[PDB]
Design a protein around this ligand. Structure first.
Ligand SMILES: O=C(O)CCc1ccccc1
Ligand SMILES: O=C(O)CCc1ccccc1
Lengths: 396, 396
C-alpha cells in the first residue's frame, strides 16, 4: 500500500529545527522558528507558569476527560482577553470558545467547520504568507488565494494594493487577518485602517477569520486587540483562532482557542454544535495541562500580575535587540539602511534577504533564518549579535 | 454565513457527561464514558503520574516546540510496548511513531494520511461499533463498512460470521481491529484466532489498522499485545493508533501514538514524511506534558514498577466489580443469567439492555449507560452496586 507514496518536503519552519540540530558547528545561531529567547539565549519556562504548575501538581485530583470544548474558565478568560471585559459580545452571549491544541489546532477546527457546514470555498491570506495557512486550509478542501499587503520599497502596509486585490474576493469568501504582529512583515494596520477594513468587510460580505497568536507583543494586551474589537463591533459573524504559545511561552503544551461569533445566542450555539462535531472527528477533546496553567494565571490576580510583567519583559527585550541589530549591522559595514526594521512589530525582522542569501547564511556561516528572509529578533542576544551581523554583512 | 447551519446531536458517549452534570438528583450513578474509578468512586491521578509530574516541575527548563512527531524517547518506549524489546520490526527500523493527542488524534492522523496518500477508500469496523470510528474516517472522506463480530446468543466472538462478512472486503481496504478489550463487547480473538486473521489478512490484501487503547486491561501488558504481534510477524505494512489515556489514567492530557509500519526503512521513512505532513495540516505538533510523563515513567525502572502495579490494581478492581455485579444482579432478583458478563475483558459489560431500557435507567433511576447497552463496570463500587442493580432489575 505504501510502496509508491511520494516523498514530501518538511514543514519549512519547523523543519529548520532538524537541520539546526544536525549542525555540529559550535558557533551556529538559530534565528528560524519564532520562539522567544532570553539574554542567555535559552527559552525559559515563565515563572508564572512554574508557579501555576506547582499549584496544579498540589491540587489536581483527576485527569478525567475535559468536555469537547475544554475548560469553561479558560473560555471565559479567553473571551475577556479577546473582546474586553463588558463587551456586548459577551453580555449578549454571541461568542462560543473551544479550547484547542494551539492556534494551529484552532485553524484546522475552523477550516473543517467551515468546509462541512457553510458555502465557504476560498480563504484569502496575505502575501507574504505564513506557510501553514495554505497547508491547513487546503487539507479541508478550501482554496487559498493571496492578497497584496506589503510595500517592500517603502516598508509599509500597501493599503491601496491590499484594498484593490481584495476586490476580487466574493461575498461569502473568508478573509484572514493577523490580529497583531503580522507574520512575517511585522507591519499591522493602524486603528484607523482596521476600522476601514471592518467597514469594507461588512459591505463586501467577507467572513473575517483572525489569526491572533501574538497578543501582547506589539504594544500591549488591550492595545493589540483593538483591530479585532473594531471588527467585532461591526460584524454579526467572525472566527478567532488565538494562541497562548508565545505570550505564555507555552509552545509545546499546545494552548489555543477557536472562538465562533454569530448574530445571536441561538445561532452561535447551533453553529458551535457543529464546531464540536468537527472536534469529535479530529482529536476528540483538548489537552488539559497547558490550558489549566493559562486559566490558573488569568483567574488569579497575583499570578496574572507576574505573568503580564513577564510578557512586558519579553516584548521589551525584543525591542532592545531590534535596535542593537540595526546598530550592529551599521557598525559591521552593511551596504543598506536597515532603519526600517525598527518599525516592525513582534518577534521578527522581515529583512529583505533573498532566498539564496539565507541559504548561504546557513551553509557558510551556520546562521539559520527562514527562506522568506524572516529572522527571529527574539533569538538574538548581546553575545550572538556580532557574529550574526558579520554573517549578514558578508552575504549582502 | 451561519444562519442556516443544521443542528447536530452530541458525541453519544462524551455527551452523556453533560446530561450527567445537569442531573441534580443526589443518587445519580455514572456508568457511561469509560474512565476508571477507584473504590471511593473517584478517578484519581496515578501516584506514578504525580511523581513524574513533580520531576517535570523540578527539571523542565523549556516549553520549546516538540518536533512534529513528538518526544523521541516516547516513540522508542511506545514501539517496545507494542512490538516487544528486540522485535525485528524495531531492529530493522521498519516502524515510525508520531506522538499524537490521544488515540483519537492518532486515528485522525492515520485517516488523513491514508486518504491523501494511498488508494484507500473504505475502512471496515466491527458491529457493534465504537461511534467515533465512523466520525473520524468519514471526516477524511473514507467510507466505513461493518463486519459481523459478536454472537449475542452465545456471548462469544462469531468467528464464522466475522470471516464470512469480511469476504466482502477488497484488497486495499483497511480493516480495523481492537488490540484487546474490544469496545464495547469485551470479547477478543484467542491467540489462535488472531493468527488465523493475520494469515487471512495477508492473503486478502487488507491493510490492518489496530486501535489499541487498553493495553494492560485484558490480561497484562505483554499478553494483550500478542494479537498485534501476530499481525506484525506476518505483514509488511500496518498502522497502530494506541492510547495511554486508560492505562496511565491520563485521559485529559491527550497521550497517544500513531505507529506506521512498512516493508523496510526506506519505505517507512518516506511514508512517515507524508504522515508528518498530515500532522502539519492539523495541530502542527503534539502536547508535551502527558507524553513527557509517560516517557519519564516508562524509562525509569522504579517509576515503571510503581506504574505497572497501579495498572494491575485497576484491572484487578474491575474484575472484582465484575463478579460483584453479577452476584448482586442475582440477589436483587434478575430474570436472566448474567454469567456471560464474567467472560468479558476490559472496563465494560455489554449487558444486553435495549436502548429503551437504558433511557428508562437514566430517566427514572438516574443511572447513566451508553445507548448500546454498554455499562462501565470500572465505574461500579461496593457503595453504588446495590442501587444500580436494583435499577437494572426494575427495567428488565
Ligand atoms: O515561526 C513561526 O512562524 C511561529 C512558530 C510556529 C511555526 C510553525 C507552526 C506553528 C508555530
Ligand atoms: O467510553 C469510551 O468508549 C472510551 C472513552 C472515550 C470516548 C469517546 C472518545 C474518546 C474516548
Amino acid at each position: 500500500m505504501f510502496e509508491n507514496i511520494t516523498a514530501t518536503t518538511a514543514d519549512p519552519i519547523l523543519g529548520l529545527a532538524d537541520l539546526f540540530r544536525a549542525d555540529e558547528r559550535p558557533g551556529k545561531i538559530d534565528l528560524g522558528i519564532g520562539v522567544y529567547k532570553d539574554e542567555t539565549g535559552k527559552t525559559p519556562v515563565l515563572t508564572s507558569v512554574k508557579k501555576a504548575e506547582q499549584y496544579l501538581l498540589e491540587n489536581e485530583t483527576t485527569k478525567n476527560y475535559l468536555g469537547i470544548d475544554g475548560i469553561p474558565e479558560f473560555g471565559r478568560c479567553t473571551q475577556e482577553l479577546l473582546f474586553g471585559k463588558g463587551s456586548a459580545l459577551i453580555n449578549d452571549k454571541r461568542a462560543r470558545t473551544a479550547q484547542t491544541p494551539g492556534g494551529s489546532g484552532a485553524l484546522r477546527v475552523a477550516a473543517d467547520f467551515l468546509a462541512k457546514n457553510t458555502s465557504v470555498k476560498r480563504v484569502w491570506v496575505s502575501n507574504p504568507s505564513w506557510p501553514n495557512h495554505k497547508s491547513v486550509f487546503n487539507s479541508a478542501g478550501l482554496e487559498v488565494r493571496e492578497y497584496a499587503y506589503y510595500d517592500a520599497e517603502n516598508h509599509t502596509l500597501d493599503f491601496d494594493a491590499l484594498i484593490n486585490s481584495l476586490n476580487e474576493a466574493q461575498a461569502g469568501d473568508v478573509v484572514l487577518f493577523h490580529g497583531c504582529c503580522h507574520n512575517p512583515t511585522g507591519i499591522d494596520p493602524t486603528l484607523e485602517q482596521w476600522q476601514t477594513l471592518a467597514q469594507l468587510s461588512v459591505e463586501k460580505g467577507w467572513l473575517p477569520l483572525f489569526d491572533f497568536a501574538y497578543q501582547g507583543f506589539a504594544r500591549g494586551l488591550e492595545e493589540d486587540a483593538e483591530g479585532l474589537r473594531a471588527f467585532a463591533a461591526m460584524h454579526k459573524e467572525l472566527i478567532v483562532a488565538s494562541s497562548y504559545s508565545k505570550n505564555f511561552a507555552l509552545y509545546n503544551e499546545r494552548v489555543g482557542a477557536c472562538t465562533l461569533v454569530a448574530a445571536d445566542s441561538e445561532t452561535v450555539d447551533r453553529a458551535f454544535g457543529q464546531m464540536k462535531a468537527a472536534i469529535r472527528a479530529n482529536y476528540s477533546s483538548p489537552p488539559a495541562h497547558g490550558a489549566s496553567v493559562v486559566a490558573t494565571i488569568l483567574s488569579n490576580d497575583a499570578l496574572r500580575a507576574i505573568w503580564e510583567q513577564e510578557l512586558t519583559d519579553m516584548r521589551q527585550r525584543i525591542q532592545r535587540m531590534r535596535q542593537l541589530f540595526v546598530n550592529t549591522l551599521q557598525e559591521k559595514g552593511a551596504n543598506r539602511d536597515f532603519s526600517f526594521i525598527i518599525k516592525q512589530n513582534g518577534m521578527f525582522s522581515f529583512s529583505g534577504l533573498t532566498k539564496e542569501q539565507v541559504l548561504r547564511l546557513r551553509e557558510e556561516f551556520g546562521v539559520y533564518a527562514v527562506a522568506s528572509g524572516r529572522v527571529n529578533v527574539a533569538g538574538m542576544t548581546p553575545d550572538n549579535m556580532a557574529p550574526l551581523c558579520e554573517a549578514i554583512v558578508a552575504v549582502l
